[PDB]
Amino acid sequence: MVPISPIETVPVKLKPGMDGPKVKQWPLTEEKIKALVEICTEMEKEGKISKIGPENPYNTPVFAIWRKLVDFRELNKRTQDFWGIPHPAGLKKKKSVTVLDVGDAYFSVPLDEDFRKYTAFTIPSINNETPGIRYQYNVLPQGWKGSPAIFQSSMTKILEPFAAQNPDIVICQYMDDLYVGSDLEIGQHRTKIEELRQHLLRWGLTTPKEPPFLWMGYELHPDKWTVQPIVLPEKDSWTVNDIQKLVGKLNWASQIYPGIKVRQLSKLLRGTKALTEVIPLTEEAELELAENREILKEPVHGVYYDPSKDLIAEIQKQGQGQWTYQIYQEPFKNLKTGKYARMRGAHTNDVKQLTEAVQKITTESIVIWGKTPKFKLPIQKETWETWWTEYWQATWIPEWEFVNTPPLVKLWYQLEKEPIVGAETFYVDGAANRETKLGKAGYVTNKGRQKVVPLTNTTNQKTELQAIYLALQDSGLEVNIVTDSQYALGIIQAQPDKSESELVNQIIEQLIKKEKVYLAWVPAHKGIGGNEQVDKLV
Amino acid sequence: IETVPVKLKPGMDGPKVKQWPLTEEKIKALVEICTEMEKEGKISKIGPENPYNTPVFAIKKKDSTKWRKLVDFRELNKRTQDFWEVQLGIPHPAGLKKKKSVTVLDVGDAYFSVPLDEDFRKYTAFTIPSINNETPGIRYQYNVLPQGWKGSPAIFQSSMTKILEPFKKQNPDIVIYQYMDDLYVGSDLEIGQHRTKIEELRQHLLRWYELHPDKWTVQPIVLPEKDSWTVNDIQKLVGKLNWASQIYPGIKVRQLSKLLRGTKALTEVIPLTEEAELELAENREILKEPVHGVYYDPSKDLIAEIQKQGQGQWTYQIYQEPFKNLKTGKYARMRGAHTNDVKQLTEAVQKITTESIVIWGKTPKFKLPIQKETWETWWTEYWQATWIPEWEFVNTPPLVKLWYQ
């Protein structure tokens, strides 16, 4: 016998305040009992388990489905605590790639000896006329909380020296599998695979498909990668669970297929939670999903990563707060794709959303390729310049170039830094009665121009915006507007190009029509002239 | 040479904090550095039995192209037992902020000579991440004292005292303070003599940043001096004065508002009356005094607010309760930061934190005028400091922006 190298165990304790599990053994049938007896017998012969006595009050329940099923749930609660999938696009193309999944994984790794007392279980004898047979685990049990971590740690420990000795190959270690790859000739590669599995055999790790590989919902071909086929359910009644499943699937599909839109479907899930409900769809949603099946008509593939070439990301605005991106190296060959949906705001603009998307793509890139890509953005250098220089918040985007592929991102209006000479000065005000919801909004100017509009079903903020809107409507191409409202100024200083308040949107449109707008603020009630609280308070 | 027992606060477990994505170069630098540190017994690899984790990344200090390892100990620091020693809670050396010049040094090399409590080591666990999760991350734990932990200088206080004992008795006029990995040394001397003294001190360390607190500013609130006043001018004035009235009690804007009466064009010149000029004068006199009843409470949190003024300039305020400011300041500094807002902001946060460390002996909690995601994405690239401040994000534009300009 060639002595196998010992795998040093991992010291394991339980949670403080809790003792080992004690649970009764459920009554089984006779066939189950015999099957379990046979299994445990041969397993004991293999050295993966050992029989115990009465000295072990801890008992974990067991079943049979033959295959043995041990339920560690309670032990999983009382066991201590232990320490994302790789993305195909990040994988660097190699000439040869071998997949080795170690068989009888957990059972090949010994268990902490002092912890073995807690893994005990009982096989009920026939008609309970005899003491139930007692066993305990000498190795890592299938279904234990601490098995995967200990297994992968041991595997890493073993694998380390082979890697350093073979720098000309690259080894990935995921869970129960190893994926080796090299640019070596298939002969040398096969040889080194043999050396590797021998090296694993020294520690007693038993190892055994071929491209393409179906792995984690993907498909890996030698020169390209994709996703496993997406099942699209079709029904006249669309439930909430259907929408969750479909959102998940579409999201999964959008890492490669460009142009996927989940917005309309995600809107249907707001405040629902009812697992069965029949929800009709808007025409926008129907055309959306039709274009989704249209995108899913002829499949396309992603390529692998080459460290020497640059990493490039290009973003397009899809409208309705939706953004789409493609990450590639050479033209028309994508490493991966994706999308960005806007955060839930009150008011917003395109530049902000674009920035957010850039940040997202940057983080994802740093995860996958470990670096920030060069960006191609549908925004002019001058636009970005003006924006970031005049923005009250600090903002930055990494290295990028302008690509002209409409719709472009632009600034729709720009407020003046200083009051405009020869431009009429509109002093505006608005107010409401919080009881009757009645209010007024209007303006007075230096040319004597005045207006006051009465309003029903409104509030102070609404009237304070309304006044500004009126000032915008009734004024020429250049206007100075004075307001006492910190709210309105707070909104306009955020520079939205779109809002969920129609009033605000109307204001925005008015601003767009203007050549020059100077918005000035003054304290209310302090008796500032031109600011008239009396006109709106009658 | 002997480990002093260290535990956590009652009812608190070790920090479990997600490691954020790192760029390839930083990962490599961390790998090399940690290999070297492993060979020196400063850290040792660990197994799955250690669920605890603390974030780690890599930086570059001033005037150096060599990478440095930076652990983020914030969660561990707050979970670390409040450290009181035989020092009896040493009061801050408030003669430090009064000094002519102050030099900051990195003493972190020393912390690696002292062993750490064996039970506590499991809490220092960190992870070097791998690109695209292709291999499990490399996990270490500290043997010696880690830089960045609040317990490290606390434990090393005695050693540091025994080391700096000759220097302090030699020239008592030189103030010495210690915060984290950094050692601050004040003097009234000349910059050359200062630097020579610093060489003397560092060589005195071997055998075992230049600031200017006197040149630091406490900013008064000022009003414009004009021959002619437009409607807009007076309106802004009334705004700033009304704002300041929240702080200074005696501020009254009524006679200035009396000038604005009627509807006039923003650009129309309005002559000041006698009552108005008198009011403005009284306001000026009021603003020239300090603030009434302003004190620093060590049992309270320090808040720092930063406003972006544009053209590379930034303003800030350190306070405890609103409208009562312990300090205010302005940062125009231009070094290679012209085209980058976030780099500027980062260096500003560093400056303010440093000043705060000098004055109160502790760092403030910043309120940053930046989106969470942008900051979180880019802040580690520009960060040269060994400690880290806490921060939050203000996403609503302040109206007071131009009132500090």
Ligand SMILES: N#C/C=C/c1cc(Cl)cc(Oc2ccccc2OCCn2ccc(=O)[nH]c2=O)c1
């Ligand atoms: N089941 C299963 C397999 C899954 C699997 C998972 C990972 Cl994380 C990596 C992997 O293959 C690689 C292993 C080592 C280095 C590079 C590799 O890939 C580089 C790209 N590539 C992919 C497939 C192919 O045939 N050729 C090829 O060059 C395979």
